[PDB]
Design a protein around this nucleic acid. Structure first.
Ligand SMILES: Nc1ncnc2c1ncn2[C@@H]1O[C@H](COP(=O)(O)OP(=O)(O)OP(=O)(O)O)[C@@H](O)[C@H]1O
Ligand SMILES: [K+]
Ligand SMILES: [Mg+2]
Ligand SMILES: [Mg+2]
Ligand SMILES: [Mg+2]
Ligand SMILES: [Mg+2]
Ligand SMILES: [Mg+2]
Ligand SMILES: [Mg+2]
Ligand SMILES: [Mg+2]
Ligand SMILES: [Mg+2]
Lengths: 175, 118, 133, 79, 47, 73, 211
RNA sequence: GCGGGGUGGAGCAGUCUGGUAGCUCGUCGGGCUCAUAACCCGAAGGUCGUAGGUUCAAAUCCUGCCCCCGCAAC
RNA sequence: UCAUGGAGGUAGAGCACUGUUUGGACUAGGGGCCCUUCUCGGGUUACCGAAUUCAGAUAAACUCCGAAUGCCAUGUACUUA
RNA sequence: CUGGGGCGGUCGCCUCCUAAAGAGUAACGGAGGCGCCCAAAGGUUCCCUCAGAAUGGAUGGAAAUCAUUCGCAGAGUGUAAAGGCACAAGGGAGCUUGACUGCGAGACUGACAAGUCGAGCAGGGACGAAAGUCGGGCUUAGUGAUCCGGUGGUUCCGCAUG
RNA sequence: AGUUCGGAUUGUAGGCUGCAACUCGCCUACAUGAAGCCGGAAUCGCUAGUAAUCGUGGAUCAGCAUGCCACGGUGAAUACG
RNA sequence: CUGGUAGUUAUGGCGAGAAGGUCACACCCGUUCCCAUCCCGAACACGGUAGUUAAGCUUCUCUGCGCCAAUGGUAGUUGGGGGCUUCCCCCUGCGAGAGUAGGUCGCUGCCGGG
């Protein structure tokens, strides 16, 4: 619990002495992380999920759920009910471990890593990026990846605004 | 995030329950309310709305601390007593929107054990 | 004028009883043409009246056509008996009731306006009068 | 978590082999190595290339300004 | 989609008629249904 | 082209408020629950409201946008 | 009519040595079957393989796919095998399963090839236990064509086929971009199809770039 | 309004039975010939009138429109 | 007939949905003059323009509303057959 | 049948409007559908809730999947439409076969034939702890007389008796 | 064996010539390693030191040849008619 | 007073703002057992009270949205009677919708702890 220890040790006091909260429970936390592939190629081949699911479970440490289409679309040649991509929800020890691994190891492995966009905020106080290419993570080899695809990483927060969210993520080590 | 209200979703379930259960003098409803510290419970008829009998893990009597589950059993036994006193023999169980798994099932089966019939 | 898309092609004739539901009070323009009696008014009549008003105003002013020909009518051809179905649609009409302001003008003086509305009314099967804000 | 469904996930020590930055965190990959870092526990060792401890965006980044391109080359070749 | 008699295994008596899609259900259906001769529930299979 | 209709099904009410009614009687034929079933009243497969005990019909409001019917001896 | 629709797998150069086989006497229970006199097989070759009953043919094909070093198939060859006794199917799976597992290719392409074999929509969920002697052959060949193969190898595909399917297979082997090594006791089929011949006679295997 | 049709440049299939582009003539190129034709050798040229649907996929099954040939009406 | 209680969605009215529609704001996008140019992206055009939104009209097969009458019944009322 | 007959169309069942606020109500009056399907698209028990928009986002775009917010339903309801449904009748999962046998006080409708609803009693079961629900599907179409033959079954008859 | 075949094409760096080598010379080094696994219908030279094959030289010319004209080295098959 | 539990057509709501509390309701802490998730101790479920009133929750304030809401008139209308009859007028009775004055942050009841 490297980063959880770190959190409760340093950042909560620091962050609350900055934003001047009326109590200790107004202080933001990360509720969860949500990883999602977003596969559309699975309309035409079943091997693609067979890759992506195993690959997320290796990247992440728990099985992903294959998400399905809420409605049918002909512009993508997409019938309702088809399996489209998979997702994982990381909470607790494993979201903390995922951020640890992320900033420590994998974010630097990107081609020209000069951080990531600070403007990428939903407006409500949460953050999203996307790993362009899953080989960036160490748990998976490059020699296993038939074809690269990315995945969205949502870092959800109890923060009420972009400022508090950014400071939380800056103290945790997101550039 | 706007987190949930557990009590509100619990009442949404409780309406699924109450669309098929209500209480009458011949056969009241035995409601179970559950909290994290304790359990409350009542026996009431809906035609009138007078809680005929009750019990809880907040009283001055019979207190004990067996991790709240055997306390639930005690509350069951105690409504059974206090209702067989007032003449009640038959009721319909109302799980309050909570599941019939743990503390609630324990309460229920303690009642069924003692002098109370479903 | 026509409606572009219609749900039901064929439609009952209807009534023109009662005063107009609304549109009796000239709102937008300064002057306007009020129907004193009820009648149908066709798209062709509206086009004629509009053009006459606009020519006399010589591309001046702002015109408003309040009415629209929503409803349709049929007519059976000649030499065709009664029955064997309802006829085919021929034309679009507005059932105008009494009190209704069919046309409004802003942007011109009294004389021009009154004379253009006069020129318009003669193209219409309704007895009219002219009325100000 | 269920039984049987998820893959083997265990606490593993990363080490940046650029500067020997040691760091514990959970993962699912041995890299065929084991150490007993943070005395009282065994941990596999998932060695790695550059980490946050050494990446230029987190550290100095002015490096690799080596040549202007064709110009010093011309002037170096012909004086 | 075809109509189907259902006979009892203990009796051989055709206690019921129902239907099935003959592609999605290509086999003799089996279902537990009451046999009034025996006055108990009994397994009936298609004929 | 056109010109076909179906036989009408005699929907609507069949007993009045204040009218004594014997059990099993039909009270309101309908599609869906244009009137919900109430006290001593059922709803059939085709949504018909029928009485279950001998009693006296009463039409009664539920919340604003809905109605029911009950039978009280 | 039937005709087979093949995806453009790989188009390696006509003339590339696909299999070099050096001269070697063979035996399976110790007893000699024949002596190979050495040879090579190039890409685009429609090689027939001829012999009597119990001649060594199926044995030789097993040696190929087991990669005897005396029979060096070059890399990038992508073998694909069809057996006399149809072991290449899984008798448990439905045929959409059996073919969508082994197809490297798109679902649309998988279904196009099945259509070219003239399997109806009703058939896809039938057991392999549930099929005609000809439909099983078509299953393995359709599976072989979905696999990305550049080198088909086919022990007696003429077994349970009708005239339409034999003509369509003739067309297939005769038009096939890659390379192919087939067995058939139909003189008609082998005359219609054979650009090259592998002949087993009097315990002597030989090779001929004839018909 | 009623029938046929609309598929490389022309005439015709293929549609009913969805995966399959075909026959004859022609065109382009190279040969033969002093040159053209004929003949011999190769190759190109069609998203099937069109806009939408259904289907894993449409010349093909469904719908609307636009064109041509006939027959009526006028 | 009087009283009382009820079902019911017509006339009318209304726009709270669905359609039809007028004017204004504003625009995805299409056409052009083009600057250019791997026409990539801009100057953009009132030449149009999906939609979105503000005000105002319309409706047998539209309704947030909604009568009179008529209908069902109850009563011991008051007449009458 | 028929605004003469004929051609063309129609002939039986369901849904709206006409149909005038109970019901019913015609026309060669205006619009559409049916002659099925489903072994789960049924029964129960438990669980939850949609469309669409605003942004944030890697392939990925007007629009696939994801996070947050708004959102009484602007979705879905096997299929036409009307009514109705979010305290489900809409969606998942488990267990199953009540898509049971005998019947049915009483009502609806109604020329007759027929069609419709039905609490409840008994038998023996399914689900659920239980209450209790379940005699097909949110409802309303999905169908056709007798006569004659066929199949299965039966403590029925069997032209003097067997 | 698409191979240590083949040697194109391309990148960088060199050398000569010439006032000058982008358009537009030749040559070198390194790397790249293309097409090509003996050629459709057709069609050409050759009867002896010839054909085939290997190098050499000369002219033109600062430089710029797979072209041209001469040189020798090796050295066949066949001609029924 | 507060925790449950009801009924009442939202005057009862939505939104905004303020005060308070491990007495309760909570949030929170953990997954060691039951049991759990197309993944996930978020939910459910279990075991606990270290921190907090931030939010849910209790109380209070409001008329921004919503909802209700007359009186008067107008429409339409039963019956009767007139005409000039796409329609209209008059007598009597009934009588809207819209809109407006105005109301609304709930109102009653039971049980248990304190
Ligand atoms: N594993 C084995 N063990 C023993 N004998 C074998 C084995 N495999 C094959 N044989 C024998 O080898 C001989 C030829 O075998 P194989 O079946 O390969 O012949 P073939 O020429 O392919 O025949 P066919 O075309 O009739 O199948 C036969 O006598 C056969 O019995
Ligand atoms: K006039
Ligand atoms: Mg039914
Ligand atoms: Mg067979
Ligand atoms: Mg095709
Ligand atoms: Mg009206
Ligand atoms: Mg209307
Ligand atoms: Mg009526
Ligand atoms: Mg006898
Ligand atoms: Mg000679």
């Amino acid at each position: 619990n490297r980063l959880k220890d770190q959190y409760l040790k340093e950042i909560v006091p620091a962050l609350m002495s900055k934003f001047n909260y009326d109590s200790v429970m107004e202080v933001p936390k990360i509720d969860k992380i949500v990883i999602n592939t977003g596969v559309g190629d699975a309309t035409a081949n079943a091997k693609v999920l067979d890759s992506a699911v195993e690959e997320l479970a290796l990247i992440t440490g728990q099985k992903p759920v294959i998400t399905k289409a809420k409605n049918s679309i002909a512009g993508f040649r997409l019938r309702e009910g088809m399996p489209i991509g998979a997702k994982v929800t990381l909470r607790g020890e494993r979201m903390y471990d995922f951020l640890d691994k992320l900033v420590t190891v994998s974010l630097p492995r990107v081609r020209d890593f000069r951080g990531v966009s600070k403007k990428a905020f939903d407006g409500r106080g949460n953050y999203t990026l996307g790993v362009r290419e899953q080989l960036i993570f160490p748990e998976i080899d490059y020699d296993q990846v038939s074809k690269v695809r990315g995945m969205d990483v949502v870092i959800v927060t109890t923060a009420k605004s972009d400022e508090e969210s950014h400071e939380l993520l800056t103290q945790l080590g997101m550039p | 995030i706007t987190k949930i209200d557990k009590n509100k979703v619990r009442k949404k379930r409780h309406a699924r329950v109450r669309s098929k259960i209500s209480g009458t003098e011949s056969r009241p409803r035995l409601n179970v309310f559950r909290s994290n510290k304790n359990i409350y419970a009542q026996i009431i008829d809906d035609v009138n709305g007078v809680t005929l009998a009750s019990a809880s893990n907040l009283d001055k009597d019979f207190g004990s601390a067996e991790s709240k589950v055997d306390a639930a059993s005690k509350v069951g036994e105690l409504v059974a007593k206090r209702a067989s006193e007032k003449g009640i023999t038959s009721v319909t169980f109302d799980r309050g929107g909570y599941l019939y798994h743990g503390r609630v099932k324990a309460l229920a089966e303690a009642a069924r054990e003692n002098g109370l019939e479903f | 004028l026509v409606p572009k898309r219609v749900k039901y092609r064929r439609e009952f004739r209807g009534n023109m009883r009662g005063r107009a539901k609304g549109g009796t009070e000239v709102a937008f323009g300064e002057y306007g043409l009020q129907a004193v009696e009820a009648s149908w008014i066709t798209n062709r009549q509206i086009e004629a009246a509009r053009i006459a008003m606009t020519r006399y105003m010589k591309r001046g002013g702002k015109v408003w056509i309040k009415i629209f020909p929503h409803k349709s009518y049929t007519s059976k051809p000649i030499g065709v008996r009664m029955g064997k179905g309802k006829g085919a649609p021929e034309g679009w009409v507005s059932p105008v009731k009494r009190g209704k302001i069919m046309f409004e003008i802003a942007g011109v003086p009294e004389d021009v306006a009154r004379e253009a509305l006069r020129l318009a009314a003669h193209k219409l099967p309704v007895k009219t009068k002219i009325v100000k804000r | 978590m269920k039984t049987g469904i998820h893959p083997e996930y265990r606490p593993v020590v990363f080490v940046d082999t650029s500067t020997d930055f040691k760091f514990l965190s959970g993962s699912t990959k041995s890299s065929s190595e084991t150490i007993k870092w943070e005395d009282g526990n065994e941990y596999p060792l998932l060695r790695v290339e550059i980490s946050s401890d050494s990446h230029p965006f987190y550290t100095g980044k002015q490096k690799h300004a080596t040549a202007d391109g064709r110009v010093d080359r011309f002037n170096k070749k012909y004086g | 989609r075809v109509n189907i008699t259902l006979e009892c295994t203990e009796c051989g008596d055709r206690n019921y008629i129902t239907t099935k899609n003959k592609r999605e259900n290509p086999e003799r259906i089996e279902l537990k249904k009451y046999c009034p001769r025996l006055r108990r529930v009994t397994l009936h299979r298609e004929t | 082209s056109n010109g076909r209709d179906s036989e009408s099904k005699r929907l609507g009410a069949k007993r009045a408020d204040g009218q004594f009614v014997t059990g099993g009687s039909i009270l309101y034929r309908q599609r869906g629950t244009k009137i919900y079933p109430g006290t001593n009243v059922g709803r059939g497969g085709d949504d018909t409201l029928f009485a279950k005990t001998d009693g006296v019909v009463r039409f009664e409001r539920m919340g604003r946008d809905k109605k029911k019917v009950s039978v009280y001896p | 009519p039937i005709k087979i629709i093949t995806p453009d797998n790989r188009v390696i150069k006509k003339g590339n040595t696909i299999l070099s086989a050096k001269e070697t006497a063979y035996e399976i229970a110790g007893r000699k079957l024949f002596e190979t006199k050495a040879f090579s097989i190039k890409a685009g070759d429609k090689v027939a393989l001829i012999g009597e009953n119990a001649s060594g043919k199926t044995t030789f094909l097993k040696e190929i796919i087991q990669e005897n070093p005396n029979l060096l198939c070059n890399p990038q060859a992508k073998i694909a095998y069809f057996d006399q006794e149809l072991n290449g199917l899984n008798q448990t799976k439905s045929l959409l399963e059996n073919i969508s597992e082994i197809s490297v290719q798109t679902k649309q392409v998988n279904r196009e090839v099945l259509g070219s074999m003239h399997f109806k929509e009703s058939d896809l969920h039938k057991e392999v236990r549930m099929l005609s002697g000809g439909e099983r052959v078509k299953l393995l060949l359709s599976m072989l064509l979905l696999s990305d193969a550049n080198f088909l190898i086919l022990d007696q595909p003429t077994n349970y086929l009708d005239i339409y399917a034999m003509e369509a297979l003739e067309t297939l082997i005769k038009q096939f971009a890659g390379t192919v090594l087939f067995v058939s006791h139909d003189r008609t089929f082998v005359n219609h199809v054979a650009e090259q011949l592998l002949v087993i006679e009097n315990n002597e295997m030989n090779f001929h770039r004839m018909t």
